[PDB]
């Protein structure tokens, strides 16, 4: 999987299995990887998990999960909108499937290309630079580990 960080850095990391791209107190992103050829350097994403944190007054905690040959327009809870039905803060639009979050100014673009999924996230600076204790492993913000990197 070809990585494009917020700092405009291009790195080719293997990132075999479950690895976190975005991890904070406003948004959680988890992706798993499997090689297309058995016992090879090349890898590709097969499952994307987006978790929205429980915020008072706006939206309840809704877990999104997307796998191979499955592009859901809703969360595992079955609901299309975040939190209450009357609340229009968190919404998912389908055509290509896109996510809109006005409470954390993010737009996630997901689509199936061949046999593997694609990902595109647009987030502001202040929300992208949020981190708690023992939270320093972000592949979307900072560069991927040199162990997974191929040179």
């Amino acid at each position: 999987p070809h990585l494009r960080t917020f700092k405009d850095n291009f790195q080719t990391c293997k990132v075999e299995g479950a690895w976190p791209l975005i991890d904070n107190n406003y948004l959680s992103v988890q992706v798993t990887n499997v090689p297309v050829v058995p016992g090879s350097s090349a890898t590709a994403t097969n499952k994307i998990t987006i978790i929205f944190k429980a915020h008072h007054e706006c939206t309840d905690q809704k877990v999104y999960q997307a796998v191979t040959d499955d592009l859901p327009a809703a969360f595992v809870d079955g609901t299309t909108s975040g939190g209450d039905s009357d609340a229009k803060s968190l919404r998912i639009v389908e055509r290509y499937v896109e996510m809109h979050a006005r409470y954390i100014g993010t737009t996630v673009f997901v689509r199936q290309v061949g046999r593997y999924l694609t990902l595109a996230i647009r987030m502001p600076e202040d929300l992208a630079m949020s981190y708690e204790e023992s939270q320093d492993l972000q592949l979307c913000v900072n560069g991927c580990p040199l162990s997974e990197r191929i040179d």
């Binding site: 999987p1 070809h2 791209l21 803060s89 990902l119 600076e125 992208a128």
Partner: peptide, 15 residues
Amino acid sequence: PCNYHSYLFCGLFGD
């Protein structure tokens, strides 16, 4: 009320 009141991009695609 619930709304936000520079955007940074992040990409991920297979080989």
